[PDB]
Tab-separated table of N, CA and C in Angstrom:
chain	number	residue	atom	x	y	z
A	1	UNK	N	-90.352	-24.729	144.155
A	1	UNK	CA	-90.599	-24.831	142.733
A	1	UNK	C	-90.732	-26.237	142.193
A	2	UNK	N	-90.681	-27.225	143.016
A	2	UNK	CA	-91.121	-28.490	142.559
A	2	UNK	C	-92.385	-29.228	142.987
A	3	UNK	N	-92.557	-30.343	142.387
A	3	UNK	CA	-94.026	-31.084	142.403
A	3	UNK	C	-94.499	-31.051	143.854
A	4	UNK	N	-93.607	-31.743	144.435
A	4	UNK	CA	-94.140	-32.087	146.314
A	4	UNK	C	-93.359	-31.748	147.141
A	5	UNK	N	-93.055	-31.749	148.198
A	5	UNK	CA	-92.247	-31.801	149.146
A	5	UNK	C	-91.740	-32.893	149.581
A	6	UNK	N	-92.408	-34.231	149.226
A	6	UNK	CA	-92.041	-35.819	150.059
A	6	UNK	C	-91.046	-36.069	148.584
A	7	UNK	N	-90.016	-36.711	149.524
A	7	UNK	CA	-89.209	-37.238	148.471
A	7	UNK	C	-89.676	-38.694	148.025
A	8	UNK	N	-90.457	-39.093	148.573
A	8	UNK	CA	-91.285	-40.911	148.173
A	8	UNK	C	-91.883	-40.521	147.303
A	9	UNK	N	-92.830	-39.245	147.284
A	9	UNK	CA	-93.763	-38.980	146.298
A	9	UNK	C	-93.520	-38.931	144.753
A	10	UNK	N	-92.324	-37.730	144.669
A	10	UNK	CA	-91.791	-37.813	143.655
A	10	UNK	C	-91.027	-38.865	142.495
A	11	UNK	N	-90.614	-39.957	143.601
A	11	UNK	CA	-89.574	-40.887	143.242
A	11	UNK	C	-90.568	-41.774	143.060
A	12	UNK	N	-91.517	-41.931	142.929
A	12	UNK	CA	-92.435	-42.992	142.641
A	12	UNK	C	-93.061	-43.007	141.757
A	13	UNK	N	-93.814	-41.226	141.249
A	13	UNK	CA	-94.720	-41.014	140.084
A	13	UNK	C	-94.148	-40.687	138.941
A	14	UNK	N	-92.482	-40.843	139.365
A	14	UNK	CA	-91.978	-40.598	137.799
A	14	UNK	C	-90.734	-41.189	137.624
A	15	UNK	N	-89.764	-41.073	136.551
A	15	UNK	CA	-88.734	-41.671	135.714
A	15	UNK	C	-87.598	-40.981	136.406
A	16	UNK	N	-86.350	-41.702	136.718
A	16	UNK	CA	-85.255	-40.876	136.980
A	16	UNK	C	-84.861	-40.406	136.142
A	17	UNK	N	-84.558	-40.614	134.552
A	17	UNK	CA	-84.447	-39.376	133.584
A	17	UNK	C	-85.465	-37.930	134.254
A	18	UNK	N	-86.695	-37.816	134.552
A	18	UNK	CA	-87.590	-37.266	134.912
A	18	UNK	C	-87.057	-36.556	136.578
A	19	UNK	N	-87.149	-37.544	136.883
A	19	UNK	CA	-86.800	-37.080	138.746
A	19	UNK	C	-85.852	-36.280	139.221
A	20	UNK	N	-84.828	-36.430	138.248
A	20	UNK	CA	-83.653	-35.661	138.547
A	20	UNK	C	-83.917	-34.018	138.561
A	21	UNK	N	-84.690	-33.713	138.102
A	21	UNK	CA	-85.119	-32.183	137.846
A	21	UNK	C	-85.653	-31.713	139.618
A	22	UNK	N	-86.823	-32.887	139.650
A	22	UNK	CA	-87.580	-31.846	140.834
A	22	UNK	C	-86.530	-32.297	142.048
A	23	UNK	N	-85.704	-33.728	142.137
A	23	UNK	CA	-84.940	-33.503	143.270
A	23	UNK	C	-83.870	-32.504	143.245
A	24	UNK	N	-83.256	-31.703	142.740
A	24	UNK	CA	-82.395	-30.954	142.683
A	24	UNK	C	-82.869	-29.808	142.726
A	25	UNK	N	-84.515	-29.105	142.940
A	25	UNK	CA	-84.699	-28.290	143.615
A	25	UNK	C	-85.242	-28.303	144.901
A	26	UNK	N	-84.536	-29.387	145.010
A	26	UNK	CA	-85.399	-29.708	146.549
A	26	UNK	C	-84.166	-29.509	147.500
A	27	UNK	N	-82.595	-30.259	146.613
A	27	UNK	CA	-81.531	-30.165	147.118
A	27	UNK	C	-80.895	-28.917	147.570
A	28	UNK	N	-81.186	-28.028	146.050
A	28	UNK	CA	-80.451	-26.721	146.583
A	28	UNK	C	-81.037	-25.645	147.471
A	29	UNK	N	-82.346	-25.863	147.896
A	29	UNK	CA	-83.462	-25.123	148.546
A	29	UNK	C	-83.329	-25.781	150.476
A	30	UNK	N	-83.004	-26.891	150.154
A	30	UNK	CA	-82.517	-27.280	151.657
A	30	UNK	C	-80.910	-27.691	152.029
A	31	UNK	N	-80.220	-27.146	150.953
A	31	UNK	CA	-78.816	-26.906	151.306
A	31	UNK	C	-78.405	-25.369	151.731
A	32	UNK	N	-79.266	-24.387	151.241
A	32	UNK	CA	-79.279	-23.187	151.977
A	32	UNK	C	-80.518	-23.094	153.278
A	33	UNK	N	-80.682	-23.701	153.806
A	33	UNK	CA	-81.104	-23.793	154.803
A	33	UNK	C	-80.229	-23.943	156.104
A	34	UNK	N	-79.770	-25.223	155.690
A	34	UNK	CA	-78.814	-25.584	156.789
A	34	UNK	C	-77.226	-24.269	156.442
A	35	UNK	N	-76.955	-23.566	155.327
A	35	UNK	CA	-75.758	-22.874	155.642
A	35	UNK	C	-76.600	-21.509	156.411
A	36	UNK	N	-77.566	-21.246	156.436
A	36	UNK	CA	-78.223	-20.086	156.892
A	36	UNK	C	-78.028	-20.366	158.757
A	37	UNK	N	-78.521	-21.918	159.036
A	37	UNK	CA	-78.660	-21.839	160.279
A	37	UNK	C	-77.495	-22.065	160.782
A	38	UNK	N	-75.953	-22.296	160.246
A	38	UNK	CA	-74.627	-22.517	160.907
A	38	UNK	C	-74.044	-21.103	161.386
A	39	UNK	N	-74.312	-20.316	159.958
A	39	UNK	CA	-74.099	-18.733	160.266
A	39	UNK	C	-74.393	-17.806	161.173
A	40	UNK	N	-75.691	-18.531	161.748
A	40	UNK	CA	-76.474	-17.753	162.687
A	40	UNK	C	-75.702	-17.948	164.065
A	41	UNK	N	-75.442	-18.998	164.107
A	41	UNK	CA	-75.144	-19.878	165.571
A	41	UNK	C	-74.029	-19.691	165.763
A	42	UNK	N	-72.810	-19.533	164.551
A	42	UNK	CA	-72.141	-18.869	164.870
A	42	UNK	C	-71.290	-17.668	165.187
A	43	UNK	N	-72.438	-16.886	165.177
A	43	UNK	CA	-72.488	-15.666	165.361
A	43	UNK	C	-73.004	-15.148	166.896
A	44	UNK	N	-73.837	-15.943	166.784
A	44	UNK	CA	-73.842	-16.461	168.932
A	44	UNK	C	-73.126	-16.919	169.564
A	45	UNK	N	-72.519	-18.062	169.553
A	45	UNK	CA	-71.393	-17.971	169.975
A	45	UNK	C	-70.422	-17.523	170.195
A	46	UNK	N	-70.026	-16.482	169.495
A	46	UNK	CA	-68.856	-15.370	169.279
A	46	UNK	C	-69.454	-14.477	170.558
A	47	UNK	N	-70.667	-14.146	170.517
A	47	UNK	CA	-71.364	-13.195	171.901
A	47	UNK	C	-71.550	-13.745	173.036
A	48	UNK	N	-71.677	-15.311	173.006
A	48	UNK	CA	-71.524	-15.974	174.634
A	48	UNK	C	-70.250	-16.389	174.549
A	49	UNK	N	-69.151	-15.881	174.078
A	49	UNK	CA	-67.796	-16.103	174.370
A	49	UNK	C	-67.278	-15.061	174.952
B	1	UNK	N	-96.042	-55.906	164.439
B	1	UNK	CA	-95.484	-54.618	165.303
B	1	UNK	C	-94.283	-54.830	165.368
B	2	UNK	N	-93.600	-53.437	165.940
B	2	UNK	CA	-92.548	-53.603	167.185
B	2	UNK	C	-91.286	-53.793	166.384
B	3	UNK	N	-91.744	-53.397	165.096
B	3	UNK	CA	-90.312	-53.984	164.484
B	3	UNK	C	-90.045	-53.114	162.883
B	4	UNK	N	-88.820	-52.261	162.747
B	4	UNK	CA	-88.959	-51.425	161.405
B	4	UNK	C	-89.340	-52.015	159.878
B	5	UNK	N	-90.081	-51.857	160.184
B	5	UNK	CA	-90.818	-52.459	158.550
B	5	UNK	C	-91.299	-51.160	157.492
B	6	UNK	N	-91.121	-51.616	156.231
B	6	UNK	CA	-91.581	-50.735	154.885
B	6	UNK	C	-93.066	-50.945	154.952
B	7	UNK	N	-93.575	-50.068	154.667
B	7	UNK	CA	-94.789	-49.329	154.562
B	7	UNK	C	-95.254	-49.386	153.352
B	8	UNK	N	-96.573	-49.819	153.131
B	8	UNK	CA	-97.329	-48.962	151.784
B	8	UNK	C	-98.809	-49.376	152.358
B	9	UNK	N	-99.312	-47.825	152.463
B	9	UNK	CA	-100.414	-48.012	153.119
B	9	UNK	C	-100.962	-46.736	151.713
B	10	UNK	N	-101.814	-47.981	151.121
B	10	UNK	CA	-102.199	-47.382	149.737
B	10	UNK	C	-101.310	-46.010	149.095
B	11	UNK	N	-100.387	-46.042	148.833
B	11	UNK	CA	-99.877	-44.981	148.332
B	11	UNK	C	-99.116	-44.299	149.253
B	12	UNK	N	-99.186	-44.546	150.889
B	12	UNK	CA	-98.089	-43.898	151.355
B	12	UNK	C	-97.065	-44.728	152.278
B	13	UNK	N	-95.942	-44.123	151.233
B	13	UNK	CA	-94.460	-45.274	151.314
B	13	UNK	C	-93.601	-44.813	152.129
B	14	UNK	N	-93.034	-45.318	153.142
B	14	UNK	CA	-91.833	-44.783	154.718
B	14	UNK	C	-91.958	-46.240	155.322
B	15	UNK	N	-90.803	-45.977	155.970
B	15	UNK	CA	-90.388	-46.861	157.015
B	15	UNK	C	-90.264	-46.344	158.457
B	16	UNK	N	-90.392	-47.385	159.211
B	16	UNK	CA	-91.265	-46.987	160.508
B	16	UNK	C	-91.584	-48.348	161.425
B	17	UNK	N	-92.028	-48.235	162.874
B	17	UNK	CA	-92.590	-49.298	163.281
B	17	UNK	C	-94.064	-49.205	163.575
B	18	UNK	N	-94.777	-50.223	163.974
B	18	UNK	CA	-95.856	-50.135	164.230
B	18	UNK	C	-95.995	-50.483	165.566
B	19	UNK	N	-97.310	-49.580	165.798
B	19	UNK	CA	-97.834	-49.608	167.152
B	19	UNK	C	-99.289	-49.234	167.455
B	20	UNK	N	-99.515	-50.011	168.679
B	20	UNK	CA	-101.510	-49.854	168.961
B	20	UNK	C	-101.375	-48.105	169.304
B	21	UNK	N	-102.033	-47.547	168.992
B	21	UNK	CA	-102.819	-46.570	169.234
B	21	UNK	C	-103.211	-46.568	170.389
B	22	UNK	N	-103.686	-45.279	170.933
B	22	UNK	CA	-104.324	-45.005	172.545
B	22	UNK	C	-105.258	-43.626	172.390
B	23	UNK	N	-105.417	-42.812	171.407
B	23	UNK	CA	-106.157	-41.978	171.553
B	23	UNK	C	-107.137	-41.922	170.226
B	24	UNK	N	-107.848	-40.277	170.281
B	24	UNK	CA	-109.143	-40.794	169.552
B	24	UNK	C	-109.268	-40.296	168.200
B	25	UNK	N	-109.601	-40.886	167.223
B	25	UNK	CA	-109.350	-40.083	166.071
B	25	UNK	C	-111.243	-39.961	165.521
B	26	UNK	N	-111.305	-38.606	164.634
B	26	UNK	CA	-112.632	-39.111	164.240
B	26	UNK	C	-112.962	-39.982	163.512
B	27	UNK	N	-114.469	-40.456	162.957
B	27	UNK	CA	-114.604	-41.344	162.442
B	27	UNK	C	-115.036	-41.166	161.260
B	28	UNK	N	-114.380	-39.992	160.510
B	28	UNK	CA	-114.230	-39.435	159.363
B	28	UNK	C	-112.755	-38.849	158.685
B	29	UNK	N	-112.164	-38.999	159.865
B	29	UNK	CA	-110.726	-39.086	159.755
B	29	UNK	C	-109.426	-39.776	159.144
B	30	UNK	N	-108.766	-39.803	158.546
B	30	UNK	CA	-107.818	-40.625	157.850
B	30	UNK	C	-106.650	-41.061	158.621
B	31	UNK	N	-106.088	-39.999	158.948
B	31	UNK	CA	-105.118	-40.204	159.059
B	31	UNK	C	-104.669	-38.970	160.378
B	32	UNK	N	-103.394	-38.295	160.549
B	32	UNK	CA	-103.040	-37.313	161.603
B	32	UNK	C	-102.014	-37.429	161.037
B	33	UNK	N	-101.344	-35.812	161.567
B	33	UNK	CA	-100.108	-35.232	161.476
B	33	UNK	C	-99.632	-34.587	162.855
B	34	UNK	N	-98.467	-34.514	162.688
B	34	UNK	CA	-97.697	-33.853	164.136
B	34	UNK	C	-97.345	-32.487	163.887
B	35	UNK	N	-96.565	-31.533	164.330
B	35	UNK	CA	-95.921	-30.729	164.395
B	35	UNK	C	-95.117	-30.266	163.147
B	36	UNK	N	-94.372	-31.524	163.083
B	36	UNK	CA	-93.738	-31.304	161.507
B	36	UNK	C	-94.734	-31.773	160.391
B	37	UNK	N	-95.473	-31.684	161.102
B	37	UNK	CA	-96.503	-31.906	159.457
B	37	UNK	C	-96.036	-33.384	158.548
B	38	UNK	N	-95.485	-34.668	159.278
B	38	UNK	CA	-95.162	-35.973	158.450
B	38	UNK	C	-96.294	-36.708	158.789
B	39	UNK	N	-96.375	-37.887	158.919
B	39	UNK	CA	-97.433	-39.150	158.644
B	39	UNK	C	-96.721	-39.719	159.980
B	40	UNK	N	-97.771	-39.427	160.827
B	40	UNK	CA	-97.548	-40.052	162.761
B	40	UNK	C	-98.514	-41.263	162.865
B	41	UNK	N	-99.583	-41.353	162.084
B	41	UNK	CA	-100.845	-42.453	162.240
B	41	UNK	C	-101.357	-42.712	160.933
B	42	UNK	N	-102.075	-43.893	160.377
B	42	UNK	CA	-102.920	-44.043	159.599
B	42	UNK	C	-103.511	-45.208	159.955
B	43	UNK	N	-104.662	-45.126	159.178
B	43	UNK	CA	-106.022	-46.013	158.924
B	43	UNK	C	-105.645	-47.234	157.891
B	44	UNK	N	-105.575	-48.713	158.084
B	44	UNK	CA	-105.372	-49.878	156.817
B	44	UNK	C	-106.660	-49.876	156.179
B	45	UNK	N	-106.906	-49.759	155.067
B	45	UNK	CA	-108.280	-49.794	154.223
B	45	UNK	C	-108.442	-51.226	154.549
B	46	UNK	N	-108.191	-52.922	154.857
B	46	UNK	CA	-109.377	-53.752	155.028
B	46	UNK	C	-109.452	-53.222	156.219
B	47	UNK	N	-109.366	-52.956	157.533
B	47	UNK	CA	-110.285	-53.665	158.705
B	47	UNK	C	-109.888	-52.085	159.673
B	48	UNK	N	-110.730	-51.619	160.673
B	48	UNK	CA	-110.912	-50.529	161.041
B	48	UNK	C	-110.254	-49.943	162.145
């Protein structure tokens, strides 16, 4: 839901009053990423144990 | 070369080192991407 995907991009064509918006959907969109892939793995592990 | 330096190659800003090239790009080509889809090569607008 934000402008780009590059974080240079964003931080360049606009105002940090401004910026703060699209980085923080960038934050919470790749902070469930990484809890998705811990969950997984450890859930494999529990089966190669 | 050979050494991490800031970048601005008209508008695109990263840090990185530089290095000669060895393969072929077209000659309508800009630039290339890898796998992850980031900025692996580019073209300097003066000299070719």
């Amino acid at each position: 839901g934000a402008i780009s995907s590059v974080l240079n991009d964003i931080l360049s064509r606009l105002d940090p009053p401004e910026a703060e918006v699209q980085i923080d959907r960038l934050i919470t969109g790749r902070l469930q990423s990484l809890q998705t892939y811990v969950t997984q793995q450890l859930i494999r592990a529990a089966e190669i144990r | 070369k050979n050494k991490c330096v800031n970048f601005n190659f008209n508008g695109l800003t990263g840090t990185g080192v530089l290095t000669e090239s060895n393969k072929k790009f077209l000659p309508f080509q800009q630039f290339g991407r890898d796998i992850a889809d980031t900025t692996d090569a580019v073209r300097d607008p003066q000299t070719l």
